[PDB]
Amino acid sequence: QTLPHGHMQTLIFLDLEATGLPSSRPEVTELCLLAVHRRALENTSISQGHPPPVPRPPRVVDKLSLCIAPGKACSPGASEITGLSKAELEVQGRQRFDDNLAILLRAFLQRQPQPCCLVAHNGDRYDFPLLQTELARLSTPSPLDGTFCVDSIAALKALEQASRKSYSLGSIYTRLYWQAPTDSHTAEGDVLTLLSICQWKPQALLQWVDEHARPFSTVKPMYGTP
DNA sequence: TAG
Ligand SMILES: [Mg+2]
Ligand SMILES: [Mg+2]
Ligand code: NA
């Protein structure tokens, strides 16, 4: 382009469940990362047919799915759709978002060939600023420091405009594949759904991602800590 | 406009 940050070598599909929506000062209850090398995406076969079948996930993938005890209760709305509550997370012995979690994420990211780019649906307004806020509370250094990120809503908008309607995760998936997504509002279900829409046009997605990746350190926290 |  020249590419502003070089080729993204690893795409990290990311999904968070949390206790509520942005004005509630929400906290994370579940986290899922799906790390895919760009080779896996460029090896995805072209989406043919109307509709095309849902693309097959790459064989080679690193996956991390974690349930996390938040510091405050879930809104009733959040619990009904995620199937999670703070109390039941604690009955199941889930720990808080803590320094160890940060050390876990860092080691997971370091397994990936660099640089890594986080991909989340509406990430620019939800997942990235939320995650930035969770990590901010920790005295521990951010494990996301040399990482990049993109919002898949912008990606799919550009990809479909390259070919009114909704750009919610489920809407896009149903429009592309004429099927309902499964396990919605679980971190891993919605991450796998996200993987599928991004595999719709894998080459165009990588190109767009390389051009719009931005440092996660420029992400503004969703809300302030004490 | 999209837990
Ligand atoms: Mg989400
Ligand atoms: Mg979800
Ligand atoms: Na393509």
Author numbering: 4 to 166, 174 to 236
Show sentences the authors wrote.
Three prime repair exonuclease 1 (TREX1) is a member of the DEDDh family of exonucleases and accounts for most of the 3′–5′ exonuclease activity in mammalian cells. In this work, we solved 4 X-ray structures of TREX1 with representative DNA substrates to delineate the molecular details of the multifaceted catalytic properties of TREX1.
To provide the structural basis for TREX1 in complexing an ssDNA substrate containing dI, we determined the TREX1-dI-ssDNA structure. In the TREX1-dI-ssDNA structure, the hypoxanthine base was designed to locate in the penultimate position at the 3′-end of dI-ssDNA as the products generated by Endo V. The last nucleotide at the 3′-end is stacked by Leu24 and Ile84. Each active site contained 2 Mg2+, MgA and MgB. MgA coordinates with Asp18, Glu20, and Asp200 of TREX1 and was in contact with the phosphate oxygens of the scissile DNA strand. The His195 general base in the active site lacked the nucleophilic water that would bind MgA, a commonly observed configuration among the structures of DEDDh members. Nuclease activity assays showed that the exonuclease activity of TREX1 in the crystallization conditions of TREX1-dI-ssDNA, TREX1-dI-T-dsDNA, and TREX1-Y-structural dsDNA was inhibited, and the nucleic acid substrate in these structures was thus intact.
